[PDB]
Amino acid sequence: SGFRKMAFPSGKVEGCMVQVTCGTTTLNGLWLDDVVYCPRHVICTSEDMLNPNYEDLLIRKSNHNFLVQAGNVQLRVIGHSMQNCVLKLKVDTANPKTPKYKFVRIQPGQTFSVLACYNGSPSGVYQCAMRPNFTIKGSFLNGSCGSVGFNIDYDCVSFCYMHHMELPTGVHAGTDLEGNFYGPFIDRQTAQAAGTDTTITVNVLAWLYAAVINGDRWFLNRFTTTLNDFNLVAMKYNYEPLTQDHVDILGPLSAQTGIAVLDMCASLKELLQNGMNGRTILGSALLEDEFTPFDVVRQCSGVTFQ
Amino acid sequence: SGFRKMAFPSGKVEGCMVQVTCGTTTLNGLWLDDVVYCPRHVICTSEDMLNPNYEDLLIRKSNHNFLVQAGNVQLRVIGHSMQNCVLKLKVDTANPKTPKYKFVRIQPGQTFSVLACYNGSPSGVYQCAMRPNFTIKGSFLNGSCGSVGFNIDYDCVSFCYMHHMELPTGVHAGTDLEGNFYGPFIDRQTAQAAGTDTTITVNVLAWLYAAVINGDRWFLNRFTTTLNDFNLVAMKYNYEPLTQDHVDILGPLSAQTGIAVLDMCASLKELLQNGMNGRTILGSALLEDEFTPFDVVRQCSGVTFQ
Numbered sequence: 001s002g003f004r005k006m007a008f009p010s011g012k013v014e015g016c017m018v019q020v021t022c023g024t025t026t027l028n029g030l031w032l033d034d035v036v037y038c039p040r041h042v043i044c045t046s047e048d049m050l051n052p053n054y055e056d057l058l059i060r061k062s063n064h065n066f067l068v069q070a071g072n073v074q075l076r077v078i079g080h081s082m083q084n085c086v087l088k089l090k091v092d093t094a095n096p097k098t099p100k101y102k103f104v105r106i107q108p109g110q111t112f113s114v115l116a117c118y119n120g121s122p123s124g125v126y127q128c129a130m131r132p133n134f135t136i137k138g139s140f141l142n143g144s145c146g147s148v149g150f151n152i153d154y155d156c157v158s159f160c161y162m163h164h165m166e167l168p169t170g171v172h173a174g175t176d177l178e179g180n181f182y183g184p185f186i187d188r189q190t191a192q193a194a195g196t197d198t199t200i201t202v203n204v205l206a207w208l209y210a211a212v213i214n215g216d217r218w219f220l221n222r223f224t225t226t227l228n229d230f231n232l233v234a235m236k237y238n239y240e241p242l243t244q245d246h247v248d249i250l251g252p253l254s255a256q257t258g259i260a261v262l263d264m265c266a267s268l269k270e271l272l273q274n275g276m277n278g279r280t281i282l283g284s285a286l287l288e289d290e291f292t293p294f295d296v297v298r299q300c301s302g303v304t305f306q
Numbered sequence: 307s308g309f310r311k312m313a314f315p316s317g318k319v320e321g322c323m324v325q326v327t328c329g330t331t332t333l334n335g336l337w338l339d340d341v342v343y344c345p346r347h348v349i350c351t352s353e354d355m356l357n358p359n360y361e362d363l364l365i366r367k368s369n370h371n372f373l374v375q376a377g378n379v380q381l382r383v384i385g386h387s388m389q390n391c392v393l394k395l396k397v398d399t400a401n402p403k404t405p406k407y408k409f410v411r412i413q414p415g416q417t418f419s420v421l422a423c424y425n426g427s428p429s430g431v432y433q434c435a436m437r438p439n440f441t442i443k444g445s446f447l448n449g450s451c452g453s454v455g456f457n458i459d460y461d462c463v464s465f466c467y468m469h470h471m472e473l474p475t476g477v478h479a480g481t482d483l484e485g486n487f488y489g490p491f492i493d494r495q496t497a498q499a500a501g502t503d504t505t506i507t508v509n510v511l512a513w514l515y516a517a518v519i520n521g522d523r524w525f526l527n528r529f530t531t532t533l534n535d536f537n538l539v540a541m542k543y544n545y546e547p548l549t550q551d552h553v554d555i556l557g558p559l560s561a562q563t564g565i566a567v568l569d570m571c572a573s574l575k576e577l578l579q580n581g582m583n584g585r586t587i588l589g590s591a592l593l594e595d596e597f598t599p600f601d602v603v604r605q606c607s608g609v610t611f612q
């Protein structure tokens with residue numbers, strides 16, 4: 001029993017973290033085979049942050065201008081190139097701890113683990129979601145850029161995020177591992193800000209099912225609703241629309257508990273219209289939307305990774 | 307910016323997890339040098355759970371009756387012995403990924419990371435606290451026993467918990483790595499239940515400081531209090547007494563923010579007497595007590611591990 005915000009084991013990713021230094025700036029890079037991937041803004045200086053001309057800054061740097069360290073060992077850079085908002089530093093040594101891996105671009109509403117790193121060394125791991133507004137609610141300080149997010153399936157690490165920027169509310173923006181930003185954001189010090197976020201409805205439902213599996217059932221009512229009527233209430237409270245694909249994705253949790261998704265929706269509608277009145281669900285006084293259905297099943301069935 | 311329930315990188319511990327099978331039961335063990343440590347109840351059967359006679363069950367088992375698997379490779383057991391509530395299985399191979407490590411018995415109020423495992427393979431990592439009532443609010447299913455909790459300092463893994471039991475409210479009980487239970491609990495299927503818990507006050511204060519560092523300041527009032535007056539309010543709301551040692555442990559966070567601990571206490575007293583009135587602190591509608599001062603400083607300063 002119990003339910004925690006659970007991260008993936010980080011070991012496969014830890015063996016890939018290195019330090020990249022270019023002049024003043026040090027941040028983190030990801031060493032896979034003989035390539036280190038890092039944020040291109042490692043080549044910037046404090047002045048040229050308003051509008052960096054990345055091609056112009058880069059043509060002034062040669063291989064030796066990138067200092068790349070894997071713990072105590074220096075990795076010699078023998079090539080470099082820019083792809084979108086990342087640098088690929090070809091090094092003379094293939095990483096012997098490269099895991100089986102894929103680069104994936106995740107969808108809003110999906111979750112992943114972040115291995116927060118400073119100077120190439122890991123600080124901690126936590127779980128996050130790609131918000132509908134293409135930000136993530138992370139925990140990141142100066143020097144954290146190049147830290148990655150990832151999922152593990154079986155034996156394969158799927159890298160989906162690299163950290164670049166912090167936006168005004170203290171939320172975070174970054175790229176996939178091809179260097180394309182999630183959302184409208186760019187690596188410039190400008191006025192950009194996050195769009196208005198929404199609450200990931202299918203995930204809230206998943207978490208209500210998680211509550212039920214753990215014996216926390218007080219919020220279940222005797223009513224049902226239609227999908228259309230549910231979605232009218234959801235819009236009012238700034239919840240995403242629930243689609244039939246969402247309903248079907250929730251099928252396994254509905255089956256385990258014997259609670260039809262639309263019945264669960266009627267209970268969610270009541271929680272949104274009436275509040276929780278001092279009560280908690282899985283130790284929380286708010287509805288939680290950063291567990292996906294798959295996350296709930298993994299945790300409540302004991303799924304492991306090779 | 308930002309603040310998350312952050313776990314330690316798990317890689318050093320992942321390389322120590324193995325599977326132990328004895329007849330019907332499979333659970334997890336911790337492979338350090340040429341010793342595998344696991345819960346002694348691996349030698350039990352479904353009937354003899356009310357009152358196992360562990361010495362009698364064990365004398366009927368020889369080395370070959372313990373099947374120990376490190377991923378795909380079988381580890382031959384060449385000795386076995388019982389220490390308190392754990393078995394130590396001497397194996398013919400020293401683990402080549404043994405990290406620098408220590409066995410520590412933590413204090414109530416302290417936090418650690420759990421690497422939840424099934425069949426020797428990791429499922430996820432999350433952060434927990436040793437509750438004042440010597441339980442932990444974990445997430446554990448059948449087969450999770452032998453999963454460990456730990457802290458990382460510099461390059462040294464300090465193992466502090468191994469998982470054995472689930473108590474009636476869905477909370478968890480286990481031992482240190484010498485096989486002594488935390489709390490009054492034992493490895494028997496009996497009526498045992500957890501004492502009444504309390505809220506870890508110094509930790510709540512640490513987390514309020516974490517809020518302030520991140521710009522979430524609305525709960526700070528203009529008042530102060532004495533330590534004795536604060537502790538009268540704390541008792542009423544089932545909070546532990548705050549000691550002068552606690553006050554001094556909070557010194558670094560008080561210094562960074564410029565908020566005297568007793569001033570912060572006056573703000574906490576107001577939150578306990580008046581509630582939050584629909585507001586949140588660091589995204590939470592409840593006060594959080596599973597961050598220690600040290601956890602807050604690590605996260606808000608970027609501490610890394612070798």
Ligand SMILES: *C(=N)[C@H](C[C@@H]1CCNC1=O)NC(=O)[C@@H]1Cc2ccccc2CN1C(=O)[C@@H](NC(=O)C(F)(F)F)C(C)(C)C
Binds near residue numbers: 044172307
């Ligand atoms: C990575 N090391 C660091 C991570 C930030 C630091 C504080 N918390 C974080 O998460 N990245 C930056 O500081 C980036 C780098 C950069 C590249 C090109 C142009 C400008 C910058 C400045 N950075 C910012 O994150 C800034 N944010 C923004 O400019 C915006 F809000 F996104 F527009 C700022 C946090 C104001 C330094």
Ligand SMILES: *C(=N)[C@H](C[C@@H]1CCNC1=O)NC(=O)[C@@H]1Cc2ccccc2CN1C(=O)[C@@H](NC(=O)C(F)(F)F)C(C)(C)C
Binds near residue numbers: 472478493
């Ligand atoms: C470890 N594999 C497993 C972890 C439990 C299973 C469900 N969730 C968990 O965290 N451990 C057990 O099930 C133990 C083992 C044991 C050893 C000796 C005697 C009896 C048992 C039965 N176990 C329990 O956890 C049981 N709890 C209690 O008996 C008590 F509440 F602590 F008294 C029970 C959860 C009822 C199976």
Ligand SMILES: [K+]
Binds near residue numbers: 053054055056
């Ligand atoms: K240009």
Ligand SMILES: [K+]
Binds near residue numbers: 359360361362
């Ligand atoms: K005995």
